[model samples]
Target: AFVGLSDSEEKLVRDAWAPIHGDLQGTANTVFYNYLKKYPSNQDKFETLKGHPLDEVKDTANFKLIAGRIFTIFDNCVKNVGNDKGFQKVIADMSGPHVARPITHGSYNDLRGVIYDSMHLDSTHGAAWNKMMDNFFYVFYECLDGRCSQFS
Candidate 1:
């Protein structure tokens, strides 16, 4: 379970996460996917990305479509930050499929870094940004039924 959000923290997260939606979404996705693309081990997780280098396919329509879907999931959860049940359901649902297969904690950590680095989150939002992200990853690990214990 997540350390519950106070009213202020909820608004802080939503305010911080919701603003960089359209253009930054594409940028962040490209940044993160690039990290995944460069690592053969990471690329192996996606059947579509297995053989082809992502540089070749990153600009494709389906790639963008999936990119949209992934970003939209975050947007949905960000916008629902104050609603505990809403936030929990969305974040947990995203992790449910991975519980069986197990996504690496490394990937999650890399994403957190990519997000903070690529999107310049900490620069703009500072302590609140850090807090929100900490809470975000906490719940992510929590929802994995302690499968993410190695990360701790």
Candidate 2:
């Protein structure tokens, strides 16, 4: 069963996300760049960014566009934390387009770790943030694995 965030946890995430949301584009660049930096081989997943040095890739429009898309989806998820229908729909929508991508659960987990570490939330907020991400990945994995009939 999917675990939804508690009201307090939802509040914690929303409060923490406020500042980061203000600089979505910049945060996206950092998160995606760091992801690639930590896992260089993942560059193969992005055709436009493939073969380019990490620094150069970060400046490309294609890279910025992709990063923005990811961050936007994350933003949507954050905004919908306590809304079950909204949260599931946001994740479902995000998962639809990537259904054919060569991404694995490991890659998703790696990105999750990068995002969590990048936020640097203290214990309380960090725990709440992790719970929110757990909820996200639960539905995300279900959707990607072709078992999201409930989401439809």
Candidate 3:
């Protein structure tokens, strides 16, 4: 993940997903609740929750709202991927912001951190994840006007 995308990165993401798929199909809600419990600070934010034993929050799939938030506020800095300060900003931003949260690149890292913590994965995942994003700005620019470098 250092110099380039490993040939196995896609496979890694695909394989790493199997258990989560199982959890989602079986009792993902339980796993999510247990995951929420691991971070005591998140307790208050979930007060609006239904308290269903099902425990699933159905709206995580709303990427426009979710990923858009990240895209608008902190996409560039967080997606810099080449810089630590920018990446850390993203990790810090999502520890709080709930409803109407101004999503940023940081939100993505925080989510990644949550998944790793819940799945009992290694801490190095962050570094590797950042590496995977090495050209986020490039890819992003490719989709937009390449002149973004002028301001971004």
Highest lDDT: which candidate?
Answer: 2
Ranking by TM-score: 2, 1, 3
By lDDT: ranked, best first: 2, 1, 3
Write model 2 residue lDDT over 1-152, tens digit each, in one string.
57777789889998878777999999999999999999888888999898889998788899999889988998998988878888988888778766789888889899999988888889999988888888888898889989777775
Worst 10 residues of 1 by lDDT: 143-152
Task: After superposing candidate 3 on the true structure, give the runs of residues whose Cα lies further than 4 Å from its correct spot.
Answer: 1-4, 25-27, 50-99, 102-111, 120-152
Q: Estimate each model's TM-score.
A: 0.76, 0.94, 0.38
lDDT value, residue 109 of candidate 2: 92
Which has the better TM-score: candidate 2, or candidate 3? 2
Clash pairs detected, candidate 1: none
Per-residue C-alpha lDDT of model 1 across residues 106-149, encoded as one tens digit per residue = 87777666666665555435556666567667778786775543
Maximum-TM-score candidate: 2
Q: Tens digits of per-residue lDDT for model 3 on 28-125? A: 44334444455434433344543532234433443124324443433333333445445434433443333244434444344445555545534354
For each candidate in the order shown, give its overall lDDT on alpha carbons: 0.65, 0.87, 0.41
lDDT (0-100) at residue 143 of candidate 2? Answer: 91
